[PDB]
């Protein structure tokens, strides 16, 4: 192999939709090819590999990949995206008869949110005197959260929780500041939020 | 091939020699050391086909290796620098690209150990307004003021670790982005039924494992030595 190319460090798929992660290689002689997954905080696990036998290779969990010589590709697919598919995926190739990894792609699964109920809530320190944070939650995946424009205001990326007790998934982002004039009513002013976001009293 | 590597986690100062060790039980000729960095995948440092063969990979500069035995392949950072901060993976292979990877070594090189600092951790209780509006209750944990960026956060409800209902930020943010040795902060949420939160019998704990100094390290400040340690915060359910 000269090389292996995955493009898009971060990609999205809707929950329930076809997963397709793209890999291309450059090698005149067909190489062996590999897809590895890395779930967060863990090591690398082999999903499947092409080793010059079947061109349609099947791996665990309904993963498959077709080796296509004529388009120099080995795209990884799975029938339906589940929230537990959130991971980094690396395609890789044999080189110099003795050893190479693509740069990886992180798969983000957008939850199917049938009844969004966007809201900004204020939360109080269990102890404290008296600190608090603001929680933007329950929006669908047409909303994204922008980073803050006040350097004393901190705002996290949106994060999806999959609450198993009730088979319920939700998005949220957190904001906080030690500043005196910080109000949750203003915390997310640099983001485009739903026109019907709930702002309690 | 139980492939094992040591250490698992390590913090070091710039300029120290650091040694990482890979061992195997299956006696494969071929052993490898890779580093992983975000956006770059796994890059090969060095590799070896026998006790008498060492070969450079793409990023061998700053590193040396020794193949001391069929079973063992050692990686050294001769003089550690901050851009050597990374996850390091060793691997063995058979003669048909059947790789076995070790579980990883997380290495952080810092310039000045005086800046090491454990997190402050706080739990923020659910909004009454959320409870009323949704019949659900989101707890927030905040870990702040920590350095280096080398933590693990978990949630515990009745003394058992929980993964359901949780989301933790994938990376901490910098408290002072304009500073090379800025401290970090990290958030997490744990959502339960408003029923479960409502029970004044239920106990919730956010636990942060911090990786810092060891007992070996000199400490000259009046503040607490910032050793590897756990920092928690808790809350109890309210009837209301």
Residue numbers in the entry:
A (entry chain A): 1 to 99, 101 to 202
B (entry chain B): 1 to 240
Question: Could you give the paper's own sentences about this structure?
Answer:
The key molecular interface that enables T-cells to sense these threats is mediated by the clonally expressed T cell receptor (TCR) that classically distinguishes between self and foreign peptides. The TCR governs T-cell specificity by discriminating between self and foreign peptides presented by MHC molecules. One key feature that is likely to facilitate this level of cross-reactivity is flexibility within the TCR complementarity-determining region loops (CDR loops) that form the antigen contact zone. The finger-like CDR loops of the TCR are thought to meld around specific pMHCs, sampling the peptide cargo, and enabling T-cell triggering by ligands with sufficient affinity/dwell-time.
